[PDB]
Amino acid sequence: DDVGIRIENLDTTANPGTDFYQYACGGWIKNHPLTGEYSRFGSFDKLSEDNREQLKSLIEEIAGKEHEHGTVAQKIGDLYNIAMDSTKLNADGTSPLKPWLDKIATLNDKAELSTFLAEMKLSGMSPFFSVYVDADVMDSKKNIFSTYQGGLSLGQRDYYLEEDESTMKIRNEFKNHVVKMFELFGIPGEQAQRQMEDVMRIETRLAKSHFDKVKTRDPYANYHKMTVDELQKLVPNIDWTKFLAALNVQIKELSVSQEEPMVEVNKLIAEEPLNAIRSYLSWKAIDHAASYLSDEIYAQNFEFYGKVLSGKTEMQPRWKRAQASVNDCLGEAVGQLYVAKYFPPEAKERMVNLVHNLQNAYAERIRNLDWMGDSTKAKAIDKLNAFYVKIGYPDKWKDYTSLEIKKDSYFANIERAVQFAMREMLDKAAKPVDRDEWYMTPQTVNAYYNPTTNEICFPAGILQYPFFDMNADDAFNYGAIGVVIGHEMTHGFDDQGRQFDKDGNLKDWWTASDAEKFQERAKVMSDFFDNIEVAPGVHANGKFTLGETLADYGGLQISYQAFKNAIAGKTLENKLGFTPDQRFFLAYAGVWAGNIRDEEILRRTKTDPHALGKWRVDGELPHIDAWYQAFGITENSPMYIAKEKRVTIW
Numbered sequence: 001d002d003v004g005i006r007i008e009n010l011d012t013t014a015n016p017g018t019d020f021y022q023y024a025c026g027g028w029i030k031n032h033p034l035t036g037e038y039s040r041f042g043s044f045d046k047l048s049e050d051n052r053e054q055l056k057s058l059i060e061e062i063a064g065k066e067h068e069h070g071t072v073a074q075k076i077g078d079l080y081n082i083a084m085d086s087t088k089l090n091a092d093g094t095s096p097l098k099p100w101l102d103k104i105a106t107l108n109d110k111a112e113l114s115t116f117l118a119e120m121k122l123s124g125m126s127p128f129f130s131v132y133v134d135a136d137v138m139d140s141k142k143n144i145f146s147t148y149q150g151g152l153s154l155g156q157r158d159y160y161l162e163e164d165e166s167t168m169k170i171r172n173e174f175k176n177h178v179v180k181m182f183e184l185f186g187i188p189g190e191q192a193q194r195q196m197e198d199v200m201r202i203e204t205r206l207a208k209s210h211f212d213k214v215k216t217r218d219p220y221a222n223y224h225k226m227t228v229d230e231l232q233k234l235v236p237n238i239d240w241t242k243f244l245a246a247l248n249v250q251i252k253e254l255s256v257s258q259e260e261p262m263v264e265v266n267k268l269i270a271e272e273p274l275n276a277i278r279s280y281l282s283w284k285a286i287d288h289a290a291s292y293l294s295d296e297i298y299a300q301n302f303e304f305y306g307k308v309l310s311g312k313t314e315m316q317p318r319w320k321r322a323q324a325s326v327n328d329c330l331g332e333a334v335g336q337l338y339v340a341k342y343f344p345p346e347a348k349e350r351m352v353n354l355v356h357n358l359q360n361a362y363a364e365r366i367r368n369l370d371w372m373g374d375s376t377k378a379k380a381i382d383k384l385n386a387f388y389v390k391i392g393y394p395d396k397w398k399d400y401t402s403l404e405i406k407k408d409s410y411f412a413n414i415e416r417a418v419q420f421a422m423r424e425m426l427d428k429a430a431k432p433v434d435r436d437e438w439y440m441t442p443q444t445v446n447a448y449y450n451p452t453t454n455e456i457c458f459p460a461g462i463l464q465y466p467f468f469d470m471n472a473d474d475a476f477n478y479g480a481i482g483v484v485i486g487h488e489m490t491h492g493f494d495d496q497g498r499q500f501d502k503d504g505n506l507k508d509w510w511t512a513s514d515a516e517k518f519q520e521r522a523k524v525m526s527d528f529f530d531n532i533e534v535a536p537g538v539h540a541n542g543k544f545t546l547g548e549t550l551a552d553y554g555g556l557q558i559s560y561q562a563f564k565n566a567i568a569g570k571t572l573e574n575k576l577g578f579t580p581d582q583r584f585f586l587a588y589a590g591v592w593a594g595n596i597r598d599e600e601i602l603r604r605t606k607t608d609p610h611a612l613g614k615w616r617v618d619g620e621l622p623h624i625d626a627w628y629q630a631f632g633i634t635e636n637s638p639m640y641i642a643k644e645k646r647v648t649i650w
């Protein structure tokens, strides 16, 4: 297989035992100058850019030909092309929303809102409040239906309430925007004024009852478990039995994440006349549809949300917005065709085998730890073997048969796609948590171990050069993606992972001895990084970055051990003059190749819990015995530290 590493990345005037990062990556630095718009640019950023061009080219290629009706290619291509057919969008005008606006006008009984609000939810609107289904934070093996404060067009309560002149301007821009939009939908000016006032009055009352975003982030405090009939007593002006039946949700209990905003919804429904409620629901429909109709309507939408609210100066071209629609609403379907082009089953199979080899090597190292007692070692190995390994793309793909894409209107297709997604989410309320369902799409360039689910997810999007190259040999791939995955693996077992059992439920399974001895070993690493000068007269924060430096250490030892196991009994061949062991460490360094501005070095030192790319290499390898052997590092090397001073935590 290919060597994977590239001479253009090296700076071979550097001494490996003096600045290994410079040796392995100095050429990359020289060949990738910062453009001006970025403070940091590394090989992760280069991959993210490469990946967005892959999706653009993929979707255009799919859309350039006709496909068999009902295939994911036909759904992708047709949705893209109907999003792009601006002559039809402009000829159709607002007519695709007429069924919704007519339906809202027939509301004649506040009791009908119970079913109607659920119907709007299924089409992707959230008047008054939001609902969602996800793993119960008190019982990770079960799902729970939750309500959440919502109903605001501006999203944040402060826009409706702060009296400074800057926020007042935003409010008055919103008022003008709502009137202009109603008028674009054929509402006469006098009625558009009156309906805008209804919208502002209602959303301002909702906003007053909301909590700040700071207070809503804790899912354990933003949790109120109760029966359906108890919610029926808390918010009597919605028939929750009908609301839930219209959502096809069959449950006995649910969570009201914030009760006060829900009580305010109850009061709003009681106190506002039905015609003002119709104004608000009509606005929710228009505001949701505003991106999917004519250019005039999109332009007005952008004038407010883009120019006023976001400080943007120019709208994105239609093709970029059409690609976002396809990627955001047919994400996993795009994933199927993405991996068919870029990440074949043999690549998935190689990576799944690699992850299993890392698991086996990690289990071997856990047995030899000198800070973990025997009972804790057994619990750790059992938790590790119970990892949910989600690599490349799903074993269980979403079934898209019930999602129909056809040439009626852009808006009608978006609506069917949202209905499909909402149905799939709400169906989970009745079922136990299914950890084979992917929350990320295959084309995403992100990866993590999740402590609350005990799953490790590495999508095809990140499994590309310089992390993983199907064409490269094991030295390259273990040194690069292998270390990255092993690093994530240690988060099931470190100071964070020890708070969760193998089901993702809260349980502290370390003994007091485990905790004391772990900190004893960890202090070796934090002291070491404390003494690194990341800039003249500026030291690293060894305690703040400890979670990440211990994990890189672990990933290095885990992947190197798995690598030596995988190549056991095979012929070593040097490539580019490097032994396989040397290539392992050169590939590792390349994962962290990067260019960073001087001021960006200072700020990341203040704020970033990850060590800088350079010290993720130069501060980690002096703790790895195998690196000394691979590059002949001796007592006379500036990076050398004595065996008895090296970290031993994994």
Ligand SMILES: [Zn+2]
Binding pocket: 473, 474, 475, 476, 567, 580
């Ligand atoms: Zn090899």
Ligand SMILES: [Zn+2]
Binding pocket: 487, 488, 491, 547, 548, 551
């Ligand atoms: Zn980490």
